[PDB]
PDB file of C-alpha atoms in Angstrom:
ATOM      1  CA  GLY A   1       0.000   0.000   0.000  1.00  0.00           C
ATOM      2  CA  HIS A   2       1.909   2.997   1.295  1.00  0.00           C
ATOM      3  CA  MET A   3       2.879   1.842   4.730  1.00  0.00           C
ATOM      4  CA  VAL A   4       6.421   2.065   6.141  1.00  0.00           C
ATOM      5  CA  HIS A   5       6.893  -1.626   6.684  1.00  0.00           C
ATOM      6  CA  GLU A   6       6.475  -1.933   2.919  1.00  0.00           C
ATOM      7  CA  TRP A   7       9.250   0.532   2.170  1.00  0.00           C
ATOM      8  CA  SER A   8      12.290  -0.999   0.689  1.00  0.00           C
ATOM      9  CA  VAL A   9      15.187   1.418   0.902  1.00  0.00           C
ATOM     10  CA  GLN A  10      14.738   4.557  -1.162  1.00  0.00           C
ATOM     11  CA  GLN A  11      11.198   4.953   0.183  1.00  0.00           C
ATOM     12  CA  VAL A  12      12.589   5.494   3.690  1.00  0.00           C
ATOM     13  CA  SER A  13      14.170   8.777   2.448  1.00  0.00           C
ATOM     14  CA  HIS A  14      10.804  10.419   1.819  1.00  0.00           C
ATOM     15  CA  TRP A  15      10.314  10.353   5.518  1.00  0.00           C
ATOM     16  CA  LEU A  16      13.824  11.505   6.516  1.00  0.00           C
ATOM     17  CA  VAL A  17      13.765  14.423   4.105  1.00  0.00           C
ATOM     18  CA  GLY A  18      10.467  15.537   5.657  1.00  0.00           C
ATOM     19  CA  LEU A  19      12.001  16.053   9.068  1.00  0.00           C
ATOM     20  CA  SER A  20      15.245  17.533   7.607  1.00  0.00           C
ATOM     21  CA  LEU A  21      16.918  14.188   8.213  1.00  0.00           C
ATOM     22  CA  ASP A  22      17.884  14.023   4.502  1.00  0.00           C
ATOM     23  CA  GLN A  23      21.405  14.026   5.890  1.00  0.00           C
ATOM     24  CA  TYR A  24      20.700  10.512   7.169  1.00  0.00           C
ATOM     25  CA  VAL A  25      19.373   9.207   3.805  1.00  0.00           C
ATOM     26  CA  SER A  26      22.981   8.950   2.642  1.00  0.00           C
ATOM     27  CA  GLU A  27      23.557   6.229   5.205  1.00  0.00           C
ATOM     28  CA  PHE A  28      19.949   4.979   5.809  1.00  0.00           C
ATOM     29  CA  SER A  29      19.788   3.828   2.227  1.00  0.00           C
ATOM     30  CA  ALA A  30      23.287   2.389   2.430  1.00  0.00           C
ATOM     31  CA  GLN A  31      22.415  -0.102   5.149  1.00  0.00           C
ATOM     32  CA  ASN A  32      19.017  -0.772   3.553  1.00  0.00           C
ATOM     33  CA  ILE A  33      17.179   0.739   6.475  1.00  0.00           C
ATOM     34  CA  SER A  34      13.525   0.233   5.736  1.00  0.00           C
ATOM     35  CA  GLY A  35      10.392   0.867   7.778  1.00  0.00           C
ATOM     36  CA  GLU A  36      11.256  -2.344   9.591  1.00  0.00           C
ATOM     37  CA  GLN A  37      14.191  -0.615  11.196  1.00  0.00           C
ATOM     38  CA  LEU A  38      12.689   2.903  11.022  1.00  0.00           C
ATOM     39  CA  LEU A  39       9.932   2.078  13.520  1.00  0.00           C
ATOM     40  CA  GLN A  40      12.177   0.428  16.081  1.00  0.00           C
ATOM     41  CA  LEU A  41      15.123   2.901  15.768  1.00  0.00           C
ATOM     42  CA  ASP A  42      17.042   3.658  18.919  1.00  0.00           C
ATOM     43  CA  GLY A  43      20.226   5.536  19.676  1.00  0.00           C
ATOM     44  CA  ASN A  44      22.358   2.493  18.862  1.00  0.00           C
ATOM     45  CA  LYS A  45      20.908   2.409  15.426  1.00  0.00           C
ATOM     46  CA  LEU A  46      21.233   6.209  14.959  1.00  0.00           C
ATOM     47  CA  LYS A  47      24.786   5.897  16.092  1.00  0.00           C
ATOM     48  CA  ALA A  48      25.321   2.993  13.692  1.00  0.00           C
ATOM     49  CA  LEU A  49      24.440   5.403  10.911  1.00  0.00           C
ATOM     50  CA  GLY A  50      27.749   7.041  11.849  1.00  0.00           C
ATOM     51  CA  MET A  51      26.112  10.426  11.886  1.00  0.00           C
ATOM     52  CA  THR A  52      25.359  10.525  15.636  1.00  0.00           C
ATOM     53  CA  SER A  53      24.036  14.068  15.200  1.00  0.00           C
ATOM     54  CA  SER A  54      22.746  15.697  18.425  1.00  0.00           C
ATOM     55  CA  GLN A  55      19.662  17.400  16.853  1.00  0.00           C
ATOM     56  CA  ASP A  56      18.730  14.332  15.018  1.00  0.00           C
ATOM     57  CA  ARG A  57      19.224  12.057  18.015  1.00  0.00           C
ATOM     58  CA  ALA A  58      16.272  13.824  19.549  1.00  0.00           C
ATOM     59  CA  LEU A  59      14.315  14.820  16.442  1.00  0.00           C
ATOM     60  CA  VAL A  60      14.268  11.603  14.402  1.00  0.00           C
ATOM     61  CA  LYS A  61      13.598   9.937  17.674  1.00  0.00           C
ATOM     62  CA  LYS A  62      10.343  11.719  18.076  1.00  0.00           C
ATOM     63  CA  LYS A  63       9.347  11.327  14.503  1.00  0.00           C
ATOM     64  CA  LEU A  64      10.116   7.612  14.254  1.00  0.00           C
ATOM     65  CA  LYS A  65       7.858   6.717  17.142  1.00  0.00           C
ATOM     66  CA  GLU A  66       4.928   8.691  15.752  1.00  0.00           C
ATOM     67  CA  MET A  67       5.560   7.268  12.265  1.00  0.00           C
ATOM     68  CA  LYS A  68       2.398   5.342  12.662  1.00  0.00           C
ATOM     69  CA  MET A  69       0.410   8.521  12.025  1.00  0.00           C
ATOM     70  CA  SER A  70       3.110  10.359  10.141  1.00  0.00           C
ATOM     71  CA  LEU A  71       3.594   7.698   7.414  1.00  0.00           C
ATOM     72  CA  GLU A  72       0.222   8.459   6.112  1.00  0.00           C
ATOM     73  CA  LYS A  73       0.020  12.180   6.397  1.00  0.00           C
ATOM     74  CA  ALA A  74       3.682  12.741   5.403  1.00  0.00           C
TER      75      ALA A  74
END
């Protein structure tokens, strides 16, 4: 359909870019981070993106947990 768990790789960017996390797409897409990993993201994962950005560590963190409503409304 259009849900995040159905995103492959490049479809995860659409989200990231929306929260200014486009900076993470460069690595998110590299490790094939899909909605599967998007939804359950934690600091360890965000750190494993090698970016470890302070803003993002809090921002993506908020966005990823509310993805359940945000995936739809974009």
